[PDB]
Amino acid sequence: PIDQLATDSNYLEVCYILLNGEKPTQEQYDEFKTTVTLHTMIHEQITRLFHAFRRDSHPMAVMCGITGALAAFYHDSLDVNNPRHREIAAFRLLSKMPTMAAMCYKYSIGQPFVYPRNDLSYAGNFLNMMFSTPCEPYEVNP
Amino acid sequence: ADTKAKLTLNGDTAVELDVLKGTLGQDVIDIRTLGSKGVFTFDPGFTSTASCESKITFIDGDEGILLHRGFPIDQLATDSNYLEVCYILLNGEKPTQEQYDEFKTTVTLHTMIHEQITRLFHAFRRDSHPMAVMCGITGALAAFYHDSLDVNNPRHREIAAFRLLSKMPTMAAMCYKYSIGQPFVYPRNDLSYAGNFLNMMFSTPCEPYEVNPILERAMDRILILHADHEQNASTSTVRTAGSSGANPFACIAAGIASLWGPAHGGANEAALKMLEEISSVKHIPEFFRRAKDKNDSFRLMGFGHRVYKNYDPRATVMRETCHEVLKELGTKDDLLEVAMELENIALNDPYFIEKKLYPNVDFYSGIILKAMGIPSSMFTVIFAMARTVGWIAHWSEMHSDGMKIARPRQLYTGYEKRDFKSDIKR
Amino acid sequence: ADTKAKLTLNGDTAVELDVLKGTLGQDVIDIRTLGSKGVFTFDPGFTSTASCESKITFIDGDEGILLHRGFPIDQLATDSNYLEVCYILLNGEKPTQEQYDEFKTTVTLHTMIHEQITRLFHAFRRDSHPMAVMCGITGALAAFYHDSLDVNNPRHREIAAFRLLSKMPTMAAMCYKYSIGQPFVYPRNDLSYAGNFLNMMFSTPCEPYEVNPILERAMDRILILHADHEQNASTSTVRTAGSSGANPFACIAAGIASLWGPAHGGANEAALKMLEEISSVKHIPEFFRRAKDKNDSFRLMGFGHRVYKNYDPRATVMRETCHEVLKELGTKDDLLEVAMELENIALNDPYFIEKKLYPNVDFYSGIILKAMGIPSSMFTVIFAMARTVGWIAHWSEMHSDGMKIARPRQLYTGYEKRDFKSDIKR
């Protein structure tokens, strides 16, 4: 039930549940969080695509434009029939969406992009990339 | 006030004019009505004309008095700090702890410059004079900070003032980083205005930078000592452009250009270079750099000033700071015997004693900045940066007053109406 | 002379001041040596103070008179062309074929801007007002053309003068193209000044642009009618920035921002809101935009002017040309014809009669530009681009005078000297 997931689980565990069909064992979850964590950054060239969008663009139009352009950069995981390519592709989108989402915002307001922080949770990592500046340390409110 | 109530002008009919008085300085003959009476004065340069009523800065040139909101410059340069002086110039009073806290908070939160504005720097030749880059960048601000351009709107001035106030040092320091090929440094919330500046100017991502309290306080003093200087030419440009309706960023950008005007004033452009290189302790100290004084360009090299007769009151605290900074920088300030010597040449040469080419605040500021490793091209960028608070104060005062638009007359001595009939067939 | 000998100023004893005589207009009282005594006048806005002696433009507002080097504006607009008027304004006399061909050849020879400045255009936002981008590029020219900044060298001055007259049209057109996302168009040596400008505005690589003869003339006349307007707020800004020694390019940038000035308000675009986005005689000029007039909401709209009492002398020829354009463009005009209702009201409506809201030159200029398919955000850019030669001439004459540094007095009414005591700790 959605209530139990929204109150008891966390986003990454729900992802594992939707993607694997079961609540992850500590180890499976650890490995899962590990694969996601290692694929958070977006190719720097993909980052230059943001600079070609009008600063005044709707972040949702920038998000569609950026996601629709991914295939040219992550050209090695495009064979949908290939079982391993789906793993890679899924993990890529899974890890990178918040990085791109947060960048849409930073770009839309004129602040520098924030790199993922391995030391943070999916939600905290997002709030960090969305609001922190290089000017002061940012502390994620629980 | 004796006969300071009234007086009269006499062309044909006796026109009575008030003799407005000040709280300090000379009285002024209110001629605001003469124009309508078909009477107009003639004063190119406005040396006999009070363009406004001001409460900001007071100067008695002969007696060397410089007051900012009534406070002597000495006390501000030694006791206050740049941000408090800004509050003083901008608000007219010494801030209560809380008012100062809130003030420092508003400034701190608006330090970063829009990343797009940062891309403008990359379009300037790396070899550009940082002062030309500074004028170009400030003059372009209005397109980015397009929501605070209504000068008539009281809240827009708050925003605009705070924007310029917070961002100038960020832009100033970037001009330098860009001019030498090092990456830009973001403001650090944990630092003071002076320390934050020294950080953005000199730190690299390669090692931690530690702000030296001596150089820090020394920079803070260079800033306060350049905060404002009454109705000079560059500030008069700020008021004039402003009364014309020009947005704050445009008026501040104009003030910067008017400020470095003398630098590229030909005689100054050439003489500053002569002094630039010659640091051989055999020419500057032994009348070589002094050999060329046909074209003066002295105020720029730190000698003499039209405002003050015998000395520049801003140089007191700066000289004392300068002596200290030189020491702090250990056994490296050896070739700086020319600093000791040029000063001796200014205090003892009959020519300098005659023309009163005394060392001014910039002779000493220049030494502190040179001692810090800052290139000379960045000297006016720093002075203009510090002067911005004065410009904002004068621009703002000009507004809240009555917004008397600059619409002067002219003595027309040109051609009387004549007919036009072209000589060309093109 | 009426009462034009000398005059007396009394307080206790008398002071004799000479009166200068102008060839046209009113004569003035010389007060240049007053401030050299202690006696200062008080005149905010300078409306009773001649700021300089000039021979460029004579205006007799109440008579609706405007002369450029003695030539009536209506004659120049009809029988001359922009460049010839530019030649006259700068030189004092009309050109011979020899002189004109030399001037023209030189102007077209330097119309192309440095390739690196084009990069600067792209760092700006696409949503930026064309006017702000214009001011931004003008204030950045000093970072490139740094070989003509010596305002004390007639060589630099003349070179700066030509680079501005040559490149301004190029700059303006590029501001339009950038805003609409169209490729920049290069200047054509074979096309006229106005023919080239329209081409740079409307050309495209998709096919060769055909310039309509009637439209080229219209544009040239717009440029002629805006070439100069005497000692106004913008020119005074240019003259004041220049008095300090500010570089040529920086001087124009301040004039541009000054001219942009009065259009930064809130209630100014609240009425301009309706004037723009709607086309119907029963919509705008009908109990909506008419009734919606809060702060300025007039001169900028094309109704009235502070200079002229009854009418705008410049508007006469602009009104005729508007007929030729409206007649010619028809299929791209007849919908905008609602100007007759705006004019009808500005003539037959009591509110407009009482406030003397006569359709100025910008009223007709606006109608034409709107019909030619030009966005209103380019209107003042076009006027500024045109006014630039006037700014250059005034700036040159200020220097011929000897560059009298603007150093006005002030009426100080602030605090007297007081000791500084600070309690804060931040």
The helix/strand/coil state of C23 is coil
Give buried/exposed letters for B195-231 (b at 16+ CB in 10 A, else e).
Answer: bbbbbbbbbeeeeebebbeebbbbbbbbbbbbbbbbb
Task: Give the chain B residue nearest A113 (alpha carbons).
Answer: B115
Chain C neighbours (≥3 Cβ pairs under 8 A) are A, B
* Domains of chain B, CATH where assigned: 1-49 (2.20.28.60), 50-266+376-412 (1.10.580.10), 267-375 (1.10.230.10)
Q: What is the resolution of this structure in A?
A: 2.2
Catalytic annotation, residues of B: 305, 362
Task: Give the chain B residue nearest A112 (alpha carbons).
Answer: B115
Active-site entry in C226, C229, C305, C399: C305
Distance CA C134, CA C172 (A): 7
**Which residues of chain A lie closer than 8 angstroms to C126, CB-CB?**
54-56
Nearest to C363 by CA among C328, C325, C329, C312: C312
Helix axes C154-180, C193-202, angle to 10 degrees: 30
Nearest to B42 by CA among B304, B412, B324, B387: B412
Q: Is the dihedral of CA C93, C94, C99, C104 positive or negative?
A: positive
Is C369 in contact with C383 (CB distance < 8 Å)?
no
Distance CA B234, CA C241 (A): 7
> Half-sphere exposure (CA, 13 Å, Cβ side) for C80?
29
Distance CA A34, CA B162 (A): 45
The C-alpha angle B229, B233, B236, rounded to 5 degrees, equals 85
Q: Element (H or E) spanning B100, and its range?
A: helix B97-108
Is B295 in contact with B271 (CB distance < 8 Å)?
yes
* A&B contacts, CB < 8 Å: 22
Is B343 in contact with B363 (CB distance < 8 Å)?
yes
CB count within 10 Å of CB C417 equals 11
Beta-sheet strand order (sheet of C71-72): C57-60, C65-68, C71-72
Nearest to C314 by CA among C88, C94, C83, C72: C72
Residues 6+ apart with CB under 8 A from B381: B130, B131, B134, B172, B175, B176
The C-alpha angle C173, C179, C180, rounded to 5 degrees, equals 95
> Half-sphere exposure (CA, 13 Å, Cβ side) for B116?
26
Please report, to the nearest 10 degrees, the dihedral formed by the alpha carbons of residues B102, B106, B109, B114 taken in order: 180
Give the bridge partners for B10, in sequence order: B14, C8
The helix/strand/coil state of B390 is helix
The helix/strand/coil state of C351 is helix
Q: Is the dihedral of CA B340, B341, B343, B347 positive or negative?
A: positive
Is B4 in contact with B21 (CB distance < 8 Å)?
yes
Give the bridge partners for B409, in sequence order: C50
Decide if B183 touches A, using CB distance below 8 A. no
Interface mutation target, options A51, A53, A54, chain C, most CBs of C under 10 Å? A54
Give the bridge partners for B116, in sequence order: none
Give the bridge partners for C411, in sequence order: B53
> How many angstroms away from the CA of C384 is the closest CA of chain A?
27
Decide if B109 touches A, using CB distance below 8 A. no
Instruction: Give the type of residue at B269.
Output: E
Nearest to B183 by CA among C304, A112, C11: A112
Distance CA A111, CA C31 (A): 55
If you search the block for the tokens 């139009």, which residue do you land on? A61
Distance CA B168, CA B381 (A): 10
Give the bridge partners for C19, in sequence order: C29
> How many angstroms away from the CA of C127 is the closest CA of chain A?
7
Q: Is the dihedral of CA B241, B244, B247, B248 positive or negative?
A: positive
Q: Which region, left, alpha or beta, applies to residue C302 given φ > 0 means left and ψ of -120 to 50 means alpha?
A: left
Would you tell me which residues 336-375 of chain C have a C-beta closer than 8 angstroms to some C-beta of chain B? none
Q: Phi first, then psi: what are they for A93, rounded to 5°?
A: -60, -45
Q: What is the DSSP letter of B182?
A: P
* DSSP-derived secondary structure for B267-292: HHHHHHHHHHH--SSSSTTTTSSTT-
The helix/strand/coil state of C216 is helix
Nearest to B369 by CA among B353, B382, B356: B382
* DSSP-derived secondary structure for chain A: -HHHHHHHS-HHHHHHHHHHSSPPPHHHHHHHHHHHHTT-S--HHHHHHHTTS-TTS-HHHHHHHHHTTHHHHSTTS--TTSHHHHHHHHHHHHHHHHHHHHHHHHHHHTPPP----TTS-HHHHHHHHHH--TTS------
* A&C contacts, CB < 8 Å: 9
If you search the block for the tokens 């609540």, which residue do you land on? A23
CB count within 10 Å of CB B173 equals 26
Select from B44, B258, B267 the Cβ nearest to the Cβ of C244: B258
> How many angstroms away from the CA of A55 is the closest CA of chain B?
8
Instruction: Retrieve residue C236's tokens.
Output: 């005074």
Instruction: Retrieve residue C405's tokens.
Output: 């540094």
Is B24 in contact with B63 (CB distance < 8 Å)?
no
3-state helix vs strand vs coil in chain C, percent to 5: 50, 10, 40
**Are residues C42 and B20, on separate chains, in Cβ contact within 8 Å?**
yes
The C-alpha angle C234, C235, C240, rounded to 5 degrees, equals 100
Select from A55, A110, A135 the Cβ nearest to the Cβ of B187: A135
Distance CA C37, CA B122 (A): 52
Residues 6+ apart with CB under 8 A from C82: C193, C194, C220, C223, C224, C227, C386
The helix/strand/coil state of C273 is helix
Q: Which method was it determined by? A: X-ray
Whole-angstrom CA distances from B80 to B75, B87, B382, B383 are: 7, 11, 19, 18
Distance CA C389, CA B92 (A): 42
Select from B115, B117, B186 the Cβ nearest to the Cβ of A135: B186
